[PDB]
Amino acid sequence: RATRKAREITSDMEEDKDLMLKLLDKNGFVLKKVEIYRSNYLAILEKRTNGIRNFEINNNGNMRIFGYKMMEHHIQKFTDIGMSCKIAKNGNVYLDIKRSAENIEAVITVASEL
DNA sequence: GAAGCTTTGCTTAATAATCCAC
DNA sequence: GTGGATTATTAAGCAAAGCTTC
Description:
By secondary structure, the protein is of the alpha+beta class. The protein has one domain: Aspartate Aminotransferase, domain 1, CATH 3.90.1150.20. The protein has three helices and six strands; from the N terminus they run αββββαββα. Helix 1 runs parallel beside helix 3. The chain starts with 10 loop residues before the first helix and ends with a helix. The structure holds a DNA duplex.
């Protein structure tokens, strides 16, 4: 038989990832490395700040922020611009929002003014 | 539609880093 | 600086779902 594909990365995703890296280096975000895990680009921060651990551009059409024990009033600032949030029992924070040049910029700007 | 493979998303366990009273 | 614990980061684990071929 055959395996699953699994799932493509589109040209839009690379550019969006390019923009993320562009804005992170622009906003002084130091990256440990970039990973592809489950067909996703993960810019893993070496120095986690304000509980944020890495910035991700996922194939589901969303941009996500992965953190640990972030302050709620910090999380609220991200939810204030339309991002959803689910906090796990262990303190992990999951922030999601639809990919777009405007939304990616707004998310990183907020993270930079944190 | 179901079996048998996979990926996928996340939790839980395991390893490494940080406190704090002596 | 150490003993002895708690907490944070990395690796393994698990249920749910997707392809692919029945």
